């Protein structure tokens, strides 16, 4: 049977994100001027289905969650796409027990995956972070999360 | 064609744990006298393989990670089994965006899944927590994590 494409997402899906050479950003507009780790050649995997793709290779205006398009936020002329999560995003340094933490480590708020797309073949994947606990970069980071409900 | 049994685990496996009617413990011996959320009827799922089982229905002396038996800690006469994780354990209130956090929420350490077994059909699953951010209990909790390397 044909596999479910990585473009189509459902609530409760387990997401696996690779962030090769991730760099540190002091303030990200999509996360309310908060630190983030971002990669230029990130890879997204649906763990249950096994499907995969490079973030730059996905047409992000066609990605649907529960049959509905992802939420869009235009910040300073840059269009960002949101993938909500149930819970926080769990990310760590590749191949090491060293494990990072997000900005809202104290709070009870869930996390989200943010993608910047230029409409072509250039996409940036952002994950929330508090400080440079995994280094200033470049650093290979693997993140895990569970897809949340559609924003209301 | 035969599926990989949930008794046999590998590094990089994605784990899905359900904690129905989870209770709060102020101090747990397996986590060095630190708060934890525990359930009596927990369910464990290997997300990639789709296999599942009740925690109480698993013979935990037969569970192998990378072909090796799980690490055991005898604490006050109670035998605990450890499932190491890559990164932290991500848990949230089931069905809600409300997301809990672990004890070492500023540290860079990874988390672990702790199981108490009596040798019969009674098993307790423990997940690290800092305070009663999800309530004193009972509360339904869903946890997600990636299996780490064997303890050395």
């Amino acid at each position, epitope marked *: 049977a044909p596999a479910r494409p990585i473009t189509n997402w459902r609530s409760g899906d387990v997401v696996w994100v690779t962030l090769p050479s991730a760099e540190y950003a002091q303030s990200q507009s999509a996360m309310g001027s908060h630190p983030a780790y971002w990669s230029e050649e990130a890879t997204i995997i649906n763990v*249950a289905t096994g499907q995969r793709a490079a973030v730059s290779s996905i047409k992000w205006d066609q990605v*649907t969650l529960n049959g*509905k398009a992802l939420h869009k936020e235009t910040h300073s002329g840059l269009v960002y796409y949101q993938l909500p999560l149930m819970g926080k995003i769990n990310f760590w340094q590749q191949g090491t027990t060293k494990a990072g933490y997000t900005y809202n480590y104290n709070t009870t708020d869930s996390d989200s995956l943010w993608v910047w797309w230029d409409g072509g073949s250039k996409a940036y994947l952002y994950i929330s972070t508090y400080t440079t606990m995994l280094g200033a970069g470049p650093v290979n980071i693997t993140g895990l999360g569970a897809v949340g409900p559609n924003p209301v | 064609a035969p599926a990989r049994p949930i008794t046999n685990w590998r590094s990089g496996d994605v784990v899905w744990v359900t904690l129905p009617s989870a209770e709060y413990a102020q101090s747990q011996s397996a986590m060095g006298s630190h708060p934890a959320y525990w359930s009596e*009827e927990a369910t464990i799922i290997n997300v990639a393989t789709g296999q599942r089982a009740a925690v109480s229905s698993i013979k935990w002396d037969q569970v192998t990670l990378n072909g090796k038996a799980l690490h055991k800690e005898t604490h006050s006469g109670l035998v605990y089994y450890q499932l190491p994780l890559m990164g932290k354990i991500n848990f949230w209130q089931q*069905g809600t965006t409300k997301a809990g956090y672990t004890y070492n929420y500023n540290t860079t350490d990874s988390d672990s899944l702790w199981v108490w077994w009596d040798g019969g059909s009674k098993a307790y699953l423990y997940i690290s927590t800092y305070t009663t951010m999800l309530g004193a209990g009972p509360v339904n909790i869903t946890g997600l994590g990636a299996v780490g390397p064997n303890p050395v």
Partner: antibody
Amino acid sequence: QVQLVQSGAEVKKPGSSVKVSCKTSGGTFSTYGISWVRQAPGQGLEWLGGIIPIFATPNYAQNFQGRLTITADESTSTAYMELTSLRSDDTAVYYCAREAQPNPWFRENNRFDPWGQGTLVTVSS
Amino acid sequence: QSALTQPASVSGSPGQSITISCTGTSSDVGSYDLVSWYQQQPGKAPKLIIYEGNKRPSGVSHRFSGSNSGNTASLTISGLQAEDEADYYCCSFAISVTFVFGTGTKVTVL
């Protein structure tokens, strides 16, 4: 053989709300799904909504969005549906059914192998 | 969302074969190789006869066969008998996380 047992038939006045429970005996919810289907007298089957208990993120049909709520309990293997603002055309036999697909993902490949006995709700006076 | 169109009335003599179609529109009805079929005799709860295109559950009579051709899923009943005089429905998954039931078909014996 797992069994799905529903609550008894109810009669409600227009504008009220009803709650039908589905009981799972011979097993647990595990990672399966629960769907609610109603059949008005003399008409066909209409899918109301469904849920996967481990996901606990219910989704409903367009006609019942903002009017139907579906919840599942893991401590007691009971699934619930709640329809508010009842009208005369809500009179139907409501069925609880199990989505016989072990993987919560791959939910497109699914079937309703066991069906509940059916609860008849009458909305009149 | 538009429902699945079904041939409301289908009839056949005892012994022949009949085919019930299930036609939909849009990609929101999913692939037709994964359409399930149910049978509802008068006064009874619906029961599954064909699922996953052409897979039969245990105890279902081997006279029920399911096909798939483009945007139409077909259920075929061979050797019509008095116990096949019931109502049959097709169901499928949607791009939105929902299930759509067919309009329903009544089988009659001449």
